[PDB]
Paper text:
[name] receptors are trimeric cation channels that permeate a wide range of monovalent and divalent cations, by responding to extracellular ATP345. In the [name] receptors, each subunit has two transmembrane helices, connected by a relatively large extracellular domain. Seven subtypes of [name] receptors, named P2X1 to P2X7, are widely expressed in excitable and non-excitable cells, and are involved in diverse physiological processes such as muscle contraction, nociception, taste signal transduction and macrophage activation. While [name] receptors lack affinities for GTP and UTP, some [name] receptors have weak affinity for [name] (20 to 50 of times lower affinity than for ATP).
In this study, we determined the crystal structure of zebrafish [name] in complex with [name], and conducted structure-based electrophysiological and spectroscopic analyses to reveal the mechanism underlying the nucleotide base specificity of [name] receptors. The subunit of [name]-bound structure is quite consistent with that of the previously determined ATP-bound structure, with root mean square deviation (RMSD) values below 0.4 Å for 324 Cα atoms, indicating that [name] can trigger the conformational changes similar to those by ATP. The overall structure forms a chalice-like shape assembled into a homotrimeric architecture, with a large extracellular domain and a small transmembrane domain, that is consistent with the previously determined [name] structures. The phosphate groups adopt a unique bent conformation and are directly recognized by the side chains of N296, R298, K316 from one subunit, and K70 and K72 from the adjacent subunit, consistent with the ATP-bound structure. The shape of the electron density for the base group was smaller than that in the ATP-bound structure, and could be readily assigned as the cytosine of the [name] molecule. While the side chain of the conserved threonine, T189, forms a hydrogen bond with the adenine ring in the ATP-bound structure, there is no equivalent hydrogen bond between the cytosine ring and the side chain of T189 in the [name]-bound structure. The O atom of the cytosine interacts with the side chain of R143, which had not been predicted in the previous superimposed model based on the ATP-bound structure. Furthermore, the NH2 atom of cytosine is recognized by the main chain carbonyl oxygen atoms of K70 and T189, as similarly observed in the ATP-bound structure, but their bond lengths seem to be 0.4–0.5 Å longer in the [name]-bound structure. Overall, the structural comparison between the [name]-bound and ATP-bound structures suggested that both [name] and ATP form three hydrogen bonds between their nucleotide bases and the receptor, but employ different residues. Therefore, the longer hydrogen bond lengths, rather than the difference in the number of hydrogen bonds, might be mainly responsible for the weaker affinity for [name] over ATP.
Author numbering:
A (entry chain A), B (entry chain A), C (entry chain A): 36 to 359
Write the structure that this text describes.
Amino acid sequence: RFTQALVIAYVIGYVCVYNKGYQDTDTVLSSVTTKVKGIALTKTSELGERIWDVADYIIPPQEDGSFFVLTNMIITTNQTQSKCAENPTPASTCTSHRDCKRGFNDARGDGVRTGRCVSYSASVKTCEVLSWCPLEKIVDPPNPPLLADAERFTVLIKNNIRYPKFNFNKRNILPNINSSYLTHCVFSRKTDPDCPIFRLGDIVGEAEEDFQIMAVRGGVMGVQIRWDCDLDMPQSWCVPRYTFRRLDNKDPDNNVAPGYNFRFAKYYKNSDGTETRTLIKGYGIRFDVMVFGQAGKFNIIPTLLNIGAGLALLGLVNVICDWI
Amino acid sequence: RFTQALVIAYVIGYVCVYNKGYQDTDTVLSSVTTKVKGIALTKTSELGERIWDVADYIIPPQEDGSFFVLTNMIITTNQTQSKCAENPTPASTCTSHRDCKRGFNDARGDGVRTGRCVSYSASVKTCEVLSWCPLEKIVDPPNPPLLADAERFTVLIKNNIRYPKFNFNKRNILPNINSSYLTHCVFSRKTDPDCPIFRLGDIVGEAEEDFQIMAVRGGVMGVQIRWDCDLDMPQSWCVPRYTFRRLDNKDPDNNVAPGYNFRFAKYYKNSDGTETRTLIKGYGIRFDVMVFGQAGKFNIIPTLLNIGAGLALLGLVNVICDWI
Amino acid sequence: RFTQALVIAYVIGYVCVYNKGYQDTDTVLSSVTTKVKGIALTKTSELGERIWDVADYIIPPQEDGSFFVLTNMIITTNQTQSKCAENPTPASTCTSHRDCKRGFNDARGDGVRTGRCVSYSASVKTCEVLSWCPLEKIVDPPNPPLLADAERFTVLIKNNIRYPKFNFNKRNILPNINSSYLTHCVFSRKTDPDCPIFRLGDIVGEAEEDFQIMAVRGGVMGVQIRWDCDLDMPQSWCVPRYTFRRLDNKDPDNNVAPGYNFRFAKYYKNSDGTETRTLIKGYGIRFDVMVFGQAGKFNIIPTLLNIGAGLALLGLVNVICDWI
Ligand SMILES: *[C@@H]1O[C@H](CO)[C@@H](O[C@@H]2O[C@H](CO)[C@@H](O[C@@H]3O[C@H](CO[C@H]4O[C@H](CO)[C@@H](O)[C@H](O)[C@@H]4O)[C@@H](O)[C@H](O[C@H]4O[C@H](CO)[C@@H](O)[C@H](O[C@H]5O[C@H](CO)[C@@H](O)[C@H](O)[C@@H]5O)[C@@H]4O)[C@@H]3O)[C@H](O)[C@H]2NC(C)=O)[C@H](O)[C@H]1NC(C)=O
Ligand SMILES: *[C@@H]1O[C@H](CO)[C@@H](O[C@@H]2O[C@H](CO)[C@@H](O[C@@H]3O[C@H](CO[C@H]4O[C@H](CO)[C@@H](O)[C@H](O)[C@@H]4O)[C@@H](O)[C@H](O[C@H]4O[C@H](CO)[C@@H](O)[C@H](O[C@H]5O[C@H](CO)[C@@H](O)[C@H](O)[C@@H]5O)[C@@H]4O)[C@@H]3O)[C@H](O)[C@H]2NC(C)=O)[C@H](O)[C@H]1NC(C)=O
Ligand SMILES: *[C@@H]1O[C@H](CO)[C@@H](O[C@@H]2O[C@H](CO)[C@@H](O[C@@H]3O[C@H](CO[C@H]4O[C@H](CO)[C@@H](O)[C@H](O)[C@@H]4O)[C@@H](O)[C@H](O[C@H]4O[C@H](CO)[C@@H](O)[C@H](O[C@H]5O[C@H](CO)[C@@H](O)[C@H](O)[C@@H]5O)[C@@H]4O)[C@@H]3O)[C@H](O)[C@H]2NC(C)=O)[C@H](O)[C@H]1NC(C)=O
Ligand SMILES: Nc1ccn([C@@H]2O[C@H](COP(=O)(O)OP(=O)(O)OP(=O)(O)O)[C@@H](O)[C@H]2O)c(=O)n1
Ligand SMILES: Nc1ccn([C@@H]2O[C@H](COP(=O)(O)OP(=O)(O)OP(=O)(O)O)[C@@H](O)[C@H]2O)c(=O)n1
Ligand SMILES: Nc1ccn([C@@H]2O[C@H](COP(=O)(O)OP(=O)(O)OP(=O)(O)O)[C@@H](O)[C@H]2O)c(=O)n1
Ligand SMILES: *[C@@H]1O[C@H](CO)[C@@H](O)[C@H](O)[C@H]1NC(C)=O
Ligand SMILES: *[C@@H]1O[C@H](CO)[C@@H](O)[C@H](O)[C@H]1NC(C)=O
Ligand SMILES: *[C@@H]1O[C@H](CO)[C@@H](O)[C@H](O)[C@H]1NC(C)=O
C-alpha cells in the first residue's frame, strides 16, 4: 500500500520523469575545425630575435579534432650527412678504434659506426658515427620555456553537430553571435561564455594546471564539448558546454617520461647543393577536442513501453509481499 | 485470443524475424587508407603558370581515415623576419610613435611592436611590428577558386573490415574487381558501383552541394562506408554501401566563420643564408571517412532466450485482460 | 527442484559471480603519445651513403594515437615546373601533335598537355605535358626495401588512462618502472613485459607477419592496449595488455592494390631562385594504437537489482513447469 504508492511514484517519478523514459534518444554526430592565432617572441644564442607565428608553431598545420602547439624547443642547426663523435655514454665511449665495430648501429646510438674511436672532448673519446652532424646537444629543455608567449595565443574551436533522428543541426557558433563579436571576443565564463575563441592559458588554467610549467616539458590537454539536449525544450537551449581537463600526467609523483615532445626537421639545399637540415626537438601541448552528447525528444512509444514495464514491477511488489 | 494471436505473431514476426533476434550480433572493426590523384593548373600574378600535384595539395600527406584537399589559396611569398607596418585596423592605426608601445604583442596583431608609428600608405599610418614581412594582404579568397581543377581529382578509398566474432575479413576492393579495372574505373551508381575510386566532384555533388562554390571558402565532407551484413546470407552480400554528406555548414543563413582554412609555410635559405618563407592561407575540403556496420549470424542461444522473453509477454496479455 | 537448484545456482554462479553483476561498470578514457627511435642506412644510385633518422622517416612527425614509419621509397629528385614527355601508356602514346589536345588534363595523366607529340624514347612518342619534371620513373619498389633497418627501430608507447566513475588514473608506465629501465629496456613477453618500448620487428612478428616482406609495399599494423580491471582487486593488477594484429590485407590471395604508400615532397629554391622539388613515393607501415577497457567495482545497487531480476526467472521456472 505504501509499498504500492512507493513503486508507483517510482515508475512515474524515477523512470518516467527523472530518467526521461518518455523520450526517444539519439547521440551526437560531430565535426570540429580549429584555428590558433598569435605570435611568440624568442631571443636565443644565436638566432637573433625571432618570431613564431601559426605556421611556425602548429605541427602539422591541420589535424582532425586535435591541435598541437609548440612550447619549448632544443634546436640543432646546420646538420649535414657526415661523420662525428657520438655523444658520450657507457654505450658510446671508447679507448681504442677496436671498441667501435664498423657498421654497428643500435637504436639508441647517434648513428652508424665508422668505426673509429675519435675525440669527443679533451678528456673523453667516443665512437665516430655517420649521422646528421653536429649531433643535438644533451641538455634539459629551457626553463622558462622559449615559447612562453604561447600562453596568450587564442584558438577558435568551430563545431558542427547533428542529430540524425531529429533532423537537428547546430553549430557552436550560436545564432546570438556574429562576425564582429569574433573579431574581438575571447571566451570567459563570466562575460563571454558564447565566444568560441579560447585563450590557451585559460584552457590549461581552468583545468587547474600552470601553462608556464607545462610548456617546459609539454603535455596533453583535453577539451570536452558536451551537447546534451532536451528537444522538447526550445532549440535555444541545446547549447554546448565546455569543460577542460589535463589528459597526461597520471602518476604526478613520477619524474619518469614526463610531458610530450617530438623531433622534426626543416631541409635546405646549400650553395654546393648538398642537403643541410635543421632539427628541432619540440615540446608542446597537444589539444584534444572531444565532442559528446545525447538528445531526447518526446515519443509515445517508449512512454507506453516504459509504463508497461513499470506496472510489471509495481504489482509484483504486492505479489512478493505474500510470495516469499 | 486475437490479443494472443497478435502478440504471438509479434514475438515471431516482430522480434524473431523482423528484428533478427535469432542472431548473434558483432560490430565492425575498420581501417582505411586513401590516395588522391590529379593535377590542377593555375595562372596568377605572378607565379607564372603553375601545376599542383598530389604532393602539393594534400596537407599533411597522410592522415588516419581523413584527407584534406587544397582548393583555394592566398599566397604571400618572400617573407623574412624583419620590420613592417601592421595592416590598418582600429587596433593597428596610429598618429604618433607614442601610440605604439614597444614589445606590445596581442593575439590579433600582425607581430611585436617596435614600437614606431610608420606609414602604411600615403593616407594611413600604423604601428611598426617585428614579423614575417611582408604581411599577408587582406583580401577575399579568389572566386572562382584557384584550384577549381580539383573537382576532377580522384580518390581511392581502400577499406579493410573485420568481424572478430565471426572470424570474418573483407576489403572494399571486392573479389569481382582486379587491377586493370582500377587502372580505369571511377565510381558511379549506374555503371561502376564497385569501383572504389571516386571523383571529388561526384562526392560533393551527390551530397547535393556545388564543388565550385565550396572550393572558395572550403568545407568538411563526410564519406560514410556502411557494412551491415547478414552472414546467414552468402558472403557475396556483405558489401559496403557509400553515402556522402556535407559535415560543416549547420546554419547556412550564416555568413559567420564560413568554411575551412589554415595557414602553412614553406621555408628556404636564400643566398645570404637567411631564412625566407612562403606563407599560404589555404582553403580546402577535409574529407572524413567514417566506417560503421553490424553483422548478425544465426545462433540458437539468443533465439531461445528471445522466445523465452516472448512468452512472458504473450501470456501476460491474457493475464492483464483480467488483472486490471 | 533440480530445476530450481539449477536456475538458483545460475543467478548466483552465472550472473552474480561469473558475469560480475555485483559490479558497477565504467569504460576507459585514454590518451596515447608515441616516439620512434633509430637510424636506417641506405646506399643507392646515387644519393651516396645516406642516413634516415626519426625526423626523416616519421610522416607527419606527430599524429594522435597513430604513427607512420617509412620503409621503402621511390625518389625522384631535381623536379621543376617545366615540360616533359608523359610516361608511355595507351592513354599517353602518340604519333602526331594532333593526338595531343593542348590543355587536356585527365586525372591519370602526368600533367597538362602542351600539346605536342614528343619523343619519349628512340622507339616511342608521347604527349608533352607541363608538370613537375622529370617524371617519377615507373618501377616496382625495391626488394629488399631501402629502409629495411627500420625493423630494428623502437617505439615508446606512452598511455594515460582514466576511469571517471572510480576516480581512477593510471599510466602504462608502471610504478615498478623508472627512468634507467627506459634507458635500456625493450619489450619482451618473457624478460621485459613491463617495458613500454617495442621493437617494430617484434610487433609485426608477434602478429605473425614478416617485417622485411611488409616493408616492401607497406601496410597497416594495429596495436591494441586493453585495460580491463577489477578494482575490487588491488590497484596492482589493472595493468594494460598488449596484442598486435595486422589491419590491412583482408583477401591475401589478392595482388590488387596491396600495402600502403603515399607521395610527399621536399621543396628548395635553387640558384636562380626557381623552385625545385624532390618527390618521394613512400611505402611504410602505419601503426594504429587502439585502447580499450572496462573497470568493474563493487556496488550494492546492481547486486540487489540483479538478484531481484534473478528470482523473477528462478520462480518462473517452477511456474512454467505447470503453466504449459
Ligand atoms: C553580435 O553578437 C554579440 C554577442 O551576442 C552582441 O553583443 C551583445 O549585445 C547586447 C546589446 O546589443 C549586450 O546586451 C547587454 O545589455 C546590458 C543592458 O543594456 C541596456 O543598456 C541601455 C543603456 O542605454 C538600456 O537602455 C537598456 O536597459 C539596455 O538593455 C548591458 O549592461 C550589457 O553590458 C555588459 O553585459 C554583460 C555583463 O554582464 C557582458 O556580456 C557584456 O560584455 C560585452 O562588452 C564588453 C565590452 O563592453 C566585452 O568585454 C565583451 O566581449 C562583450 O562584448 C557587457 O560587459 C550589454 O550591453 C550583450 O552584452 C552583448 N553580448 C556580448 C557578450 O557582447 C552584439 O549585439 C551583436 N552585434 C550586432 C551587430 O548585432
Ligand atoms: C576485372 O574486373 C572488372 C569489374 O568487375 C570486370 O569487368 C566486368 O566484366 C564483365 C564481362 O567480362 C562485364 O559484363 C557485362 O556483360 C554484359 C553482357 O555481356 C554479354 O556480351 C556478349 C557479346 O558477345 C554475349 O555473348 C553475352 O551475353 C555476354 O554475357 C555487357 O552488356 C556489359 O556491358 C556494360 O555492362 C554494364 C552496364 O549495365 C556496365 O557495368 C559495363 O561498364 C563497363 O564498361 C564501360 C566501358 O565499356 C566502362 O565505363 C566501365 O568502367 C566498365 O568497365 C558496360 O557498360 C558487360 O560486358 C561487366 O560489365 C564488367 N564490369 C565492369 C563494371 O566493368 C573484368 O572482367 C575483370 N577483368 C578480368 C581480366 O577478369
Ligand atoms: C627500475 O625498474 C626496473 C624494472 O622494474 C627494476 O628492475 C628490477 O629489479 C629487480 C631487482 O632490483 C629484479 O629482480 C630479479 O631478482 C631475481 C632474484 O634476485 C635475487 O638475487 C640475489 C643475489 O644476490 C639474491 O640474494 C636474492 O634472491 C635476490 O632476490 C634475479 O634472478 C632477476 O634476474 C632476472 O630476472 C628476470 C628473469 O626472469 C628478468 O626480468 C631480469 O631481466 C633484467 O635483466 C636483464 C639484464 O640483466 C635485462 O635484459 C632486462 O632488461 C632486465 O633489466 C633478469 O634477467 C632479477 O634480478 C627484476 O628483474 C628487475 N626487473 C627488470 C625486468 O629489470 C630496477 O630495480 C629499478 N631500478 C631502481 C633504481 O630501482
Ligand atoms: N623509442 C624510444 C623512445 C624513448 N626512449 C627513451 O625513453 C625515455 C623517456 O622517453 P621521453 O620522455 O620521450 O625521452 P626524452 O626525455 O624526450 O629523451 P630522448 O631525446 O632520448 O627521446 C628516454 O630515456 C628516451 O631516451 C627510447 O630509448 N626508445
Ligand atoms: N584564434 C582565432 C581564430 C579566429 N579568429 C577570428 O575568427 C573569425 C572567423 O574565423 P575564420 O573563418 O577562420 O577567419 P578567417 O576569415 O579565415 O580570417 P583570419 O585570417 O583572421 O583567420 C575571424 O574574424 C578571425 O580573424 C580570431 O580572432 N582568433
Ligand atoms: N586516385 C587514384 C588512386 C589510385 N589509382 C590507381 O589504383 C590502383 C591501385 O592503387 P595503389 O596501390 O595505391 O597504386 P600504386 O601501385 O601505388 O600506383 P600509383 O603510383 O599510380 O598510385 C593503381 O593502378 C593506381 O594507379 C587511381 O587510378 N586513382
Ligand atoms: C655549417 O656547417 C659547416 C661545416 O659543415 C660549418 O663550417 C659552419 O659552422 C656552418 N655554417 C653556418 C651557416 O654557420
Ligand atoms: C625578397 O625580399 C626582398 C627584400 O627582403 C625584396 O628586395 C625582393 O622583392 C624579394 N625578392 C624576390 C625574389 O622577389
Ligand atoms: C637539375 O635539373 C637540371 C635541368 O633542369 C639538370 O641540368 C640537372 O641534371 C639537375 N641538377 C642536378 C643537381 O643534378
